[model samples]
Target: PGSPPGPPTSIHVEEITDTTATLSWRPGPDNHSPITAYTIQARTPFSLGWQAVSTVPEVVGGSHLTATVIELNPWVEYEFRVLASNAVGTGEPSKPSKKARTKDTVPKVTPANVSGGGGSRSELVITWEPVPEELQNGAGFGYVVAFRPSTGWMQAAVPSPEASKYVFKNETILPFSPFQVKVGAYNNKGEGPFGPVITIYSAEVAEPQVAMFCGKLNMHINIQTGRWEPDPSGSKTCVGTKEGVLQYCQEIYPELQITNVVEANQPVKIENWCKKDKKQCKGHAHIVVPYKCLVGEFVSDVLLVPEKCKFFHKERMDMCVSHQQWHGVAKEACSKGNMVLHSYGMLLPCGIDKFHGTEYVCCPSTRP
Candidate 1:
């Protein structure tokens, strides 16, 4: 009998796909021995050792120089070797086939244990289980974590596959709150599915309120917008036009703090006051009349402040026992739209600027 055949030459990969590769090679010299069969082995840079491909019958024992390797995992760079064997023995292997990679695919599994929240001041502790390396599918692997209050949400990335947790020590998150969370994996090949939504409670023991600005109201004249706008949440309403004094303070009871005493954007026309001035002047008299004294919760620290416009027809300051910054308050109250109160004559001064009105943010005694 002849000796074992020589090594097969010119090994090449003719075709490739997601899970298979077709290889071809030239038969080596059969040292007086008929080459009865061929064996193929494939290995990837990731593999620990050679993987003998025995499933494809076309690649074993034949004159057929073409054979196929199947069951190759996706995203793998593979190189193969071919050996010719006769009755004597199998010969040396051919050079490894030109390396080719399988089609990369998205990860098949979602990361598990995605969760967050607790009842604590420093709440919103979100965490997730790591994705297994083999399942990453390609390099540049990472996880995507998304969270929201069901009311709304945001996304954060854990570019590092090893980073498994995120902490939210935000003061706004509040204690005893709830949040919805989810996690997913991604690699250079593609993105993966997200895990089930998990509701978590922050680790806070105390109850908290949304905070308050008391029952304060500030109306402003944005002539540009042509509308008397109230504080984002206050009254667009002119509460007391007739019973100015107590109506502004008394109605809001025990709320020691009186709303800002400011001027209205425009001098509102009063039926009676217009009737008397009909002979001498027009119905609209630019003046301060304590337009709105919004009342609410208890607060201290000199709640009352009075001011009158400059270019007065005498002491508008004489109307109040203590007048500090009448000019400052006049401008401030006018800008805020608080028509001030006139003790004796018309509250409107001769300035014609509409800024010449006396105003107060506190309960005042005009001896009226």
Candidate 2:
């Protein structure tokens, strides 16, 4: 049978740590003198009978005792009880103290560190120390991580619960892209405190060419690629400097249609137009020059153009003669003016017959 009821009414127990607990209560009104000692017992969550963990003696009227259940698995619930004994025997148990639970040992933590593509691109890999054998009965439930870019952080790819690594898919993640990473541990209870965060910078790509201004060359060009640089400078000979002519055309005739003149006159923007329609036009150029009838030599400024030309062949209205052929061979040559001859390779007449009928040397000029 059980011992007769003694005293002690209010009994309180508080769980201090996973395996440690505190017990205190007011003993029944001390009959003779004062209480001698008190008894403490503990029972696991599933146990029925109480087991003695420890015992205290010579307890005061309202005294307290601390009990430590050694080797108690973390995150487990248990029950405790306190008995007041005054040397005579034992008193009624303190209402089987309150239920107390132990804390689960947290899993070792690790944070995500950037990996792969040391410079060009970047990826993240996270790992952790496996949960202890006591905590995990079966295999691990897995882990998760959250992260953001360093500067213009954006949502890239969130790692799945089972994934230990993730790849950032943001366009801004390139050539020195930096980011921060954090990791979490998950199980049946929920997520635990995140591991320490880590910061990493993405790899770098090849540098692109820079824009430049050529003062002596009189040109400003910009390169729109990564790996490029300016070329060596060129000379500035005045007699015939392509730099001056090109700059002049670029400045004077911004949109001048000089596409047909390929020999001396530089064209602004040229493409493979000849390959487009298969139609042939071997482009050429013609410039004015002076002439000296006495020496039968041509003068630098004596060049004259015909008025019949227009548009693709616009005339400089300020020139001396419109269609003057300086050669007396045309009889009215001296009266007309000097002519500049040019050959665009060899092109057949559009309306002329290919065989039999032939009539050449027809000038767009009139004799006085």
Candidate 3:
């Protein structure tokens, strides 16, 4: 179909700012023949000469062009026209758009008006209204805000279609220090010029918050009574210096009270009732009677009652399957049958009585 003839389509003049104006236009129609180029015929209305300012490609997609008039003589009216062309020849100029006179001197765009929203010492939200339409698309896009306490300003992440607003993430920005911001409109005409600068006083942050402590359990402890008592000479008892007793108690149960602390390497023996008997070897429960840990330095490594300690019957050291990782080592040590190793910090308190970063766990080995 043939296109409606005559000039380009949508020929409009936009004044980006007092100093600049962008002339843009689209194609009218050539019936799909396509325009090869466009010619911009512009001149001061008062001037007798019709000067050619620019020639642009009349792209098939509808030609578009932005020409800046930097030589506008103040107080004189200017006119503009667009001509379409193809391989055949150039078409006649389109009808002239609205005419306007240039300013006597560059005009200062007064700040339309600015307002802020949202509130907080740590965060703030601010917004402002846009300038008049004739000044908006004319001025091109939106504005910019200058910040203080520092030389630069924070800009809106995305240009506002209509309104101007920005949310600051780090508030230390203006906190305490006074700050100022100003918005300006710009276009191909250069900066449409800037609006008035707005000043704001940053708020101060409050202080003196106290800290709190939380208590919880990270260790294991087990204590029970039995009807039968092992021989005092061979029974094992907890030994430590006065300070050591308090240290051990609190490490497991920080809230528990300490009665007293005894000495080092104390031989503690318990009855064979909880001892295990092997088929290949003589089955006996007296391997170690009066179960006790070494005094002084060994207190931290010892488990007064290794896990699964039964006083009524013989329980094999291998029974501590709950601590499978080190149980094998503990069981092998107990196979001696006559002498039981009671001071391994790695296996005591079911992996709680830790020392040098290793914890012990196991039932004490019984003597045969």
Candidate 4:
């Protein structure tokens, strides 16, 4: 019989669930006879001879390294090692990995309402409902998100518990490609079952346009929603109120930031008055904007016009807006704002104006 293969190297634990722990290791050098299979064994610190953990024979080829050991006690510490087997029989056991403990209990509930879609040309936004409070009462809960690309399944970070959203924006993602995502909730014990798979299509997102108003203020337009939004980064030439100062302007900038995310096909209405210096500027008026977001695949050609924001229904538009993300909780809060706007009468576009350092969106009083 040929001599046994060298001891498995780089042995370590990969995952520790309540009832199972996946062990991984690189195959060692096969002296002459090639390794045919691997045997993963586990035992307690003061236990007798090692016991074979995995029932299925781990084939040795293609240079892969992973073995799952199941049917183990939860919340108990155990050590694991791997041995290579050939015609000569099992080789010396691998140096055991550091002692590890299995989780006490598996999370009781899976992540629900798991959904994600493409956003702004290069980003994918995912959102899901939180694990029920009853299930999370025992231990602090977190989430695990994974995606399937052309390459393979890749893990993505979950957003805050309250936020329940995650964004994947990287170069690997291309417009119009299908991406698959799955989510699960985890506690101190172990991860729960993953939610249903969600597949979404990537699309092109037109960059927001920036413009100066009356040579005094700057504003930006969301091409998708056709809503005029203020540009704090713009020049500080616009002023509100007759005081000839930026008092009203500064007081409302923060509030404006929250309402800038306009939902699709929704009426926009707001008021803008002249500064103390421009009591009679004659520039105050109601403005209605339009939504220009394109639906379906975006082909940039003048020959054909794709879908527009006005054409999108409620459910479809929700998907488009969900693709968008902002700062942490603010993103969720903004989504809530958009939801509220959806319940109102027909959403319309608003006009933009600038006087001193302030930017303004003019919606009709009738719409509000």
Candidate 5:
């Protein structure tokens, strides 16, 4: 038979990934002649054209019956076919293979509508449109918020896909000063581009809304019953003095760039935060903090799964995995573990029924 062997059969698309697939097939009918070559093509639902795939080798003509296709458009439903050729010419394509979809890629477009900034006395709120599922390309979907005043630059990767609003609490972001901010979507792979930036002025003096004062209410393991107990008296115990709790406020509000503790021991209502009241809090004498972080201060890193969590950070840089019930539990666990907040990222939740993955990267401050 001298026809371009009956369209090669059993065209299988295998090992599909974000932009590649392995394709294999068996020869149709050689038509009494040695098959000279094999070519593959793909068709997608959106476009009917069956385009020739960019594959290995000038042409697959030898004993080899497989080829790898590259540069396939990601997240698209595709069907593939194989064709055989001899001295005669190219033959018809085999039956289309089962439809397959390529894996995800990084997001294509960033949040288009980014606008915000009508916040407290010292706040910069940023809001963005959510990236649709079609554009959210890979795993660990979230947003990266970046803002700067000209000299000071900072960023935060909020670990929630549906996060639309970010309220900046950094007192250093002076009121009436212009801060350019931008937001973009990201995944485990990496972040996509941050689209057009938005300029917003820090708020003029708004009344105290968020409670900045926070001190852990007195808690100690019960010696008698082997249980935990909160201070019975309403009087809470906090770090002894300003120097005693600088790291606390630094890690708690890294963006604040807090340099020194100005005041302490003012009584905020007990409800503020066990803690959060005005800058002066209730839990411990309300403490005052300053925002003049200079270069070379051991800036603490933070991670938030805010829901529930597991966590980790630099010790030797890795090898330290901290698992806990949630953010609150994780912080407590780290405090007791003798590790400092070195470097860490918010864990992608395994699920609600399952334990949260991890958070808090605790290692040495100056080590690594």
Candidate 6:
């Protein structure tokens, strides 16, 4: 009596996807009744019985040793086996393949919450929060990092989910310029959308205050409050009438420093000042005045000296006298020269109404 072909051997799964898996086997001894075909069956954990895999082609004449099963439920576990057929009958089923599962549906994607900054001169460190467990869908997760600079967009390797932080090695980042960054979550399903962009600028703290001159009224000005404007034209008064002072100090001075005081003094060149006199001063007059002082007779002419000064009128300086008194009552009433008393009896000690100490006196007449 003729017998069926022997069972196939080493039945196993080769590949798995969301809805398909390829199974393979080796032909077994036909037992002298040449094998006619091989049939593949598949079942899920809850299936009542194994059924022929409709998607896989029958291995005719046992020539092909592999079959791909399809039309599977996503993320579902399945088992597979194969057997040979002959004119006699079907052989025993091969040992079932180790249980395999198809990939689940693509997990929900989202941008990762991200932030980072220069770790040192040589590195940049970026960190992010983990993707929510619900969105992960039990799939192992990873992250992708990307950055944009003047050159263009660049990418880094995929990092494991556990690595919530990434350090860019041997990198140089500076402030005054912007560095933009973004991150996204990914898994076998696919990459998710990138998170919102972040910006970082690494530089020195801004200057707290600046001084300048307002040419409109020919007066010294100091910027001690609020944001800077290009020119001051409103009814409200500002430090300068021209924008040059602000630009020179904020844009040029910080980098170059106040090298030439005259160069740093005015909004427009001094030669151009008279020319602009006829034209109404346009724009904001915010200025960053340099630190210096000017003292002399031509008062208005001296106000543009690109420096700090305390104003004292010429008339006040001439009549003033400098001196001091302990307890003596004034014999004659006199004008006050700063803290000094210019009386008929006491002549000022410092000559110009300047306070020296509590002992010296501004004797009205030096002969006393």
Top model by TM-score, which number? 5
State which candidate, 1 or 2, has the greater TM-score.
1
In candidate 1 the C-alpha lDDT for residue 269 amounts to: 24
Q: Write the per-residue lDDT of candidate 3 for residues 205-307, one digit (tens) a residue.
A: 2111101111211111233232223212332233334244344444433344433222222322222332112223232232221212222222222133323
lDDT: the better of candidates 1 and 2: 1
Candidate 4, 131-194: lDDT as tens digits: 7554452243567666665543455333234547766666557776787878777654445778
How many angstroms is residue 224 displaced in model 2 relative to the true structure, after the best TM-score fit?
Answer: 38
Each model's number of backbone clashes?
A: 24, 18, 48, 20, 21, 23
- Measured by lDDT, the strongest candidate is 5
Kindly list the per-residue Cα lDDT of model 6 for residues 1-368, writing each as its tens digit. Answer: 78888888898899988778888898988888878888888887656689777556634446778878787766567888888998889999888888987776655565466877656554556678876544553354556666654543444433345667665543244443466778777654555678887975333222222343444322222333333332232222233322343343344234334321121222322211111243565444333433222112111111111112111111121333322231132222222433323211122123222311111123233345
The global C-alpha lDDT for each of the candidates, from Candidate 1 onward, is 0.55, 0.37, 0.42, 0.50, 0.58, 0.50
How high is the lDDT of residue 168 in model 6?
A: 54
Can you tell me which runs of candidate 3 are displaced by over 4 Å?
1-110, 117-121, 137-140, 150-158, 174-177, 202-368
TM-scores of the candidates are 0.46, 0.28, 0.26, 0.29, 0.51, 0.30
Query: Which 10 successive residues of model 4 have the least lDDT summed?
Result: 304-313
Q: What overall lDDT, based on C-alpha atoms, would model 1 receive against the true structure?
A: 0.55
Off by over 4 Å in 6: 58-60, 106-368
lDDT at position 197, candidate 2: 65
**Residue 45 in candidate 1 has what lDDT?**
70
Q: How well does candidate 1 score on lDDT at residue 247?
A: 39
How would the candidate models be sorted by TM-score, starting from the highest? 5, 1, 6, 4, 2, 3
Stretches > 4 Å off in candidate 5 = 1-4, 30-34, 44-49, 73-78, 100-137, 148-154, 158-177, 191-198, 202-368
Ranking by lDDT: 5, 1, 4, 6, 3, 2
Q: Residue 307, candidate 4: how far off, in angstroms?
A: 60
The segments of candidate 4 whose C-alpha lies over 4 angstroms from its true place after superposition are 55-63, 106-368
lDDT of 5: 0.58
